[PDB]
Amino acid sequence: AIGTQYDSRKQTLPMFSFGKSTRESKRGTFKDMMSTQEVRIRISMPKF
Amino acid sequence: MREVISIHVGQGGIQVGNACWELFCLEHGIQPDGQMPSDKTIGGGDDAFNTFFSETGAGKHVPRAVFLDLEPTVIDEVRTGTYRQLFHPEQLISGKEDAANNFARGHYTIGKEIVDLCLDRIRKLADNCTGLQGFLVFNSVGGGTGSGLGSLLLERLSVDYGKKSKLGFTIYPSPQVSTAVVEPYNSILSTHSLLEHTDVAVMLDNEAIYDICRRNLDIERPTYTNLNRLIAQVISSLTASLRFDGALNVDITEFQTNLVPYPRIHFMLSSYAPIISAEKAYHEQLSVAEITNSAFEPANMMAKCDPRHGKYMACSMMYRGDVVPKDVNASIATIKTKRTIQFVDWCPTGFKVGINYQPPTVVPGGDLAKVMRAVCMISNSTAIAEVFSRLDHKFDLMYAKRAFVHWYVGEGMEEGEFSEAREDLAALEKDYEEVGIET
Amino acid sequence: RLINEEAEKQWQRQNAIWQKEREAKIKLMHEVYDSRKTDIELKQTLVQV
Amino acid sequence: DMSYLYRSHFNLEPVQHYVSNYKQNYEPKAND
Amino acid sequence: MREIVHIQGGQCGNQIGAKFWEVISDEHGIDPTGTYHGDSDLQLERINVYYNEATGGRYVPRAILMDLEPGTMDSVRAGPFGQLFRPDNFVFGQTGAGNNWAKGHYTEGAELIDSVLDVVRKEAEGCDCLQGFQITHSLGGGTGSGMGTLLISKVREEYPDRIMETFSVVPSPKVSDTVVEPYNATLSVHQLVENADECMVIDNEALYDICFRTLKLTTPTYGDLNHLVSAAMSGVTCCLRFPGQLNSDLRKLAVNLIPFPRLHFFMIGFAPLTSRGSQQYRALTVPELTQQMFDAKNMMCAADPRHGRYLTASALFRGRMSTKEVDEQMLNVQNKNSSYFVEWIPNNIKSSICDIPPKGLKMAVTFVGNSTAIQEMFKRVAEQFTAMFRRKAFLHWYTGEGMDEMEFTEAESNMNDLVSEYQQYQDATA
Amino acid sequence: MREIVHIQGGQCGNQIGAKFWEVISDEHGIDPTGTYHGDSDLQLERINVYYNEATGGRYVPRAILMDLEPGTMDSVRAGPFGQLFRPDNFVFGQTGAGNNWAKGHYTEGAELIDSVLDVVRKEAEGCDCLQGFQITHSLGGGTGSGMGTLLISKVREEYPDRIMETFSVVPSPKVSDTVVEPYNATLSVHQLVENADECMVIDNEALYDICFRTLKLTTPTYGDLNHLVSAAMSGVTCCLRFPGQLNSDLRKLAVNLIPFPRLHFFMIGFAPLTSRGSQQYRALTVPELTQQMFDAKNMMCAADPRHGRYLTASALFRGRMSTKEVDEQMLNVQNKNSSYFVEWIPNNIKSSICDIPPKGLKMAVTFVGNSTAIQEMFKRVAEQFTAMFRRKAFLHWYTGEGMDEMEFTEAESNMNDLVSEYQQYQDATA
């Protein structure tokens, strides 16, 4: 019970392994939902 | 996170950018004053203007454009017009003294002291951009200031922003209709200078556009404004793929890799359709097969050359409206089967197809009529050699006895600058002959 | 059910934190454009004089 | 509206969720 | 138990997966909000095959979506049935390869694939015991095909004992859609052959032909094509997730549809497909099922199957039906067309039966077969590639980003050898 | 019974504590004014670990806020939870250090430390049996580091048997906050390693990697950033205040994390930290807890943890969770990834459990490991220091207050030797 067993009745828990992603491996976008939701308002401009 | 920046030079450039901007603004839904209409209340949204506008945080929206010219009247008129509150006040760098149709003047005399401001502004506007795709340039050949400034801009951009894709919408003079008496010289010089830096350029010779306008719209007294409207619609059709939803997309980056058979031959010509005025548009059914057939028809090719006079090697066309792949392939099969339009031996398929939904917005007070389907095509065909063939003859005759050479020599250009350009054109002349010959 | 009790309460205060700042900035932004209208006119008013 | 290009127009038409196993059930017990 | 993961690439792959996931969600009864609303118990017995368990019981498809261009993804996240996907697995780029295989496989993909590999490893390890993969990708697009093929070798280098598929749509010259399709398809197939365990090519031209001639709908649409593709995919893996007469997982078909190591291309078709008016004058009968299934025009590969012989053919007759009848019909069809079944391998058809039918049909069958006729597409692709390469057309682009002409020279020879070895067995006799 | 006291200095140090007491204050339910409103008794059983008693029932947090300038300490007073601090416990000068260690440890720091030391000797003896001291400071500050590195030196002089602790933040080379960062950074480390038994480092630059990617909040703020560090505060001292399966006080962790006396630098981590928008899809499970728990992107430090190996690892879980699953899941981490675990020491991870969890969630884990990857923190630090010493740049400020050029040289050599000796075991084999 501390390893791998072969019977559908008793499952085998996963054993995770480390990845190889650098601290700055690009990727971004998809900002639809965000904590702040940057402020936007509507103010009429003068006629100059 | 997709955007593009338009670099413009030359009075024709400014007056075409005007119309293209009214088209694009009316298409996204921004009034001229720059304030979103209080009734619409778009609210939380993205895209739309981003691909061509940058959020100011709140309120107005600055069109991501820069205007540069050496002549003051057009800039002053644009600033004082009804679009004053739209553009940045200081991004319209305008000079003082006219270049006066002297290409040499536009390249070494009164361009170096202002290209610096042009590049500084372009850099500042770019740094804020985070998803730069490429550039668009509109510049004339038959204008000295325009040609010189455009040459300088392209040369600097080749050294500032790397392999970023760039597109050039030049304008060449018609086979018989002319506006100046010194067009050929600046035409040849600009061709030489721009050959090895512009990836893509499409012909827009004026006489053909005159022909289409007369033939279809049935309007007998056109003016430069209508041609500008047609050109702006052409740009809109070309670029609509990047900002509206669609079942099949193509980007600006996916043009310079699909219509340039060789690194050297990168000149192609485009056409638009359908072009039917509202007075009679609806009598025909509003025949996708007939519309596609008209797309290839010799008369409406926006550049004065005979497609029948040359082979086809690359034909890229975009569809918008209620287009459907069923009609697309039904028409494509017939066009391909056609014999009168033949294809080069080593181009089994020269079709890149993109499908888009949003119909072309019809502007009030114009000639464009409401439609449901449109077809816009960008084609690089062996017939392109004709324009350069005619220009060469127009050049050697003049050069035979040093006509007008005095002012160009007196502007700092060395004597031999013309011969090298002629040699480059001849080498280009040889290439089209070589590529077009079957095995 | 209680497992949801603490999580909902904690998120409540934090959101009030998100609301307090945003409501703070929004009022200032009202100030930001407010002045500009008050200054352009003065330049406009002086023009006639 | 863009619904005329969005969803499919295919039609293919209740107590059909019994396994083939459910044929075995009940059947009560029956000189010189 | 024996769950699988989904990884789609390119715009075509994203749309195809979007339709497939909608079909799967409908078949298992999961609403867009992710709350179970089924009817019978069996709909939840093996739901673990494709979904994952989370707090509150809202099930999330275990799909990974990759693309170098954002518009398609930002569109697919807002349409119908788009809120089931985990936002975590969305990993993507911005610039794109621009229909350039070299750009999509060397310069940008090399940078982008790290995160995608990390996430795919995370999910695959998280599953109970990975059974295999499924990758659907469009060979005709450069930015897609590049990364799509690269990830194939990347995964196959770490999961040698696992089984993997490849749903591919290849561009025919008549239905041409890209000018660089010759180049990208040839380069892609070069790598696909060497590592992909299974491949099932489908032709857009044949799809259109079927949609018009059979369905008789006034106007087809991309959704119309996607729905057929998704129905075929659902048939491809139906029996793995329901009670059945004779279970046949991926490995069984893998063994029973591969004569030699280097032939891993089949063709598929879904039946019945009847005109809305023909849905009631028709009789859903066992002989009709097999007849329509072996009719040539139903295949989604534009090549005419009859131009040669089959090596192996297996079917998954879904729903409750006959067994005597399946066996006898298989015998009758194998005899009546003796010349069209290769002679040296007797009993050259496989039979599979599952009970649960589709929601809306009582009898339906998915056909998978590896036939010599596929050589037509490869031969046409080779001819088109030669006609262009011999003149150095569009050559400088793929050479300006590090790929040298030596690789191009190597790939063509391998493709030609594959074609020759595939044709040789046509003339083989015992 | 085995209580500890807080000794903090510096605006960076003050803020960390200022938010530190807020998070702890809610743990046992102490109101902002000190009025008790707790619900469960367990919140009141072990309150002595951090609080004293006084008439009126209002509780006092035994803290000693120290800084050489009035601006920072006068700030926490007016805000919430600052009223708790006893007015008599504030000791502060009036001159300012100017980020000059010379002004912060020799001339000004010594003069004021007399009074502050007095209060330190005051509260500590009051408790029944002092357990140890925990001090938070900044290595990149002038006024802070001087006293911070100095007060610790004398404190260790009177209480040799006490357990020592210090939580630190070090300046990454990428985004530098102090132009004199190299000096006050490397100069301090020499003294800290001399007496402090334990020491931790959290990299600000690594923190932003926590925010911009994990939390997915567009506008991180110093109010937000402090929260993460505060959580790690309760990560270590957690089980010391509640019942549990296997209690693990501060000193026990020391017995299982330091192979030799001269390696007392660790990197910490906290999980699960999930963005607000994605919180519904994930499913809380200890295995999922661990993978993100060992994820390369969860460590708050700048050192890449895949570039070395772990000498020892620590785990301090939270909540009613199965004892085995920690054990079974903990071992697999040392087998599937053997390459990253040293080979001469077996079964190199310890674990512990606390049955009362942090507020709001159901499971939590605190990460503590002595990893050889931390070498890259100083080599980069040393590289800048050596580059900045050859020309005697910025030498006059420090040397003008009694410190001679010889002292720097001793500091560098000690730093350099530690760099080499740290990696001696990395290449060592059994």
Ligand SMILES: Nc1nc2c(ncn2[C@@H]2O[C@H](COP(=O)(O)OP(=O)(O)OP(=O)(O)O)[C@@H](O)[C@H]2O)c(=O)[nH]1
């Ligand atoms: N399509 C179009 N072409 C124009 C228009 N105006 C001028 N041109 C073309 O431009 C050529 C002359 O150059 P312009 O663009 O007018 O002037 P420019 O670009 O400012 O350069 P300079 O004349 O040196 O100042 C003429 O031969 C015309 O063919 C216009 O309104 N529409």
Ligand SMILES: Nc1nc2c(ncn2[C@@H]2O[C@H](COP(=O)(O)OP(=O)(O)O)[C@@H](O)[C@H]2O)c(=O)[nH]1
């Ligand atoms: N049948 C079908 N094919 C599609 C669909 N979407 C894309 N494709 C195929 O994808 C090809 C174009 O690929 P492309 O979009 O450039 O791929 P990408 O460059 O990786 O994004 C075309 O040849 C189409 O055959 C679809 O909805 N249905």
Ligand SMILES: Nc1nc2c(ncn2[C@@H]2O[C@H](COP(=O)(O)OP(=O)(O)O)[C@@H](O)[C@H]2O)c(=O)[nH]1
């Ligand atoms: N995370 C975090 N870091 C801080 C905070 N305040 C200061 N720091 C760090 O402390 C460093 C400056 O230390 P300093 O205040 O000059 O120390 P001093 O000598 O005691 O004044 C900067 O590099 C900051 O990164 C804070 O509120 N949060």
Ligand SMILES: [Mg+2]
């Ligand atoms: Mg002009």
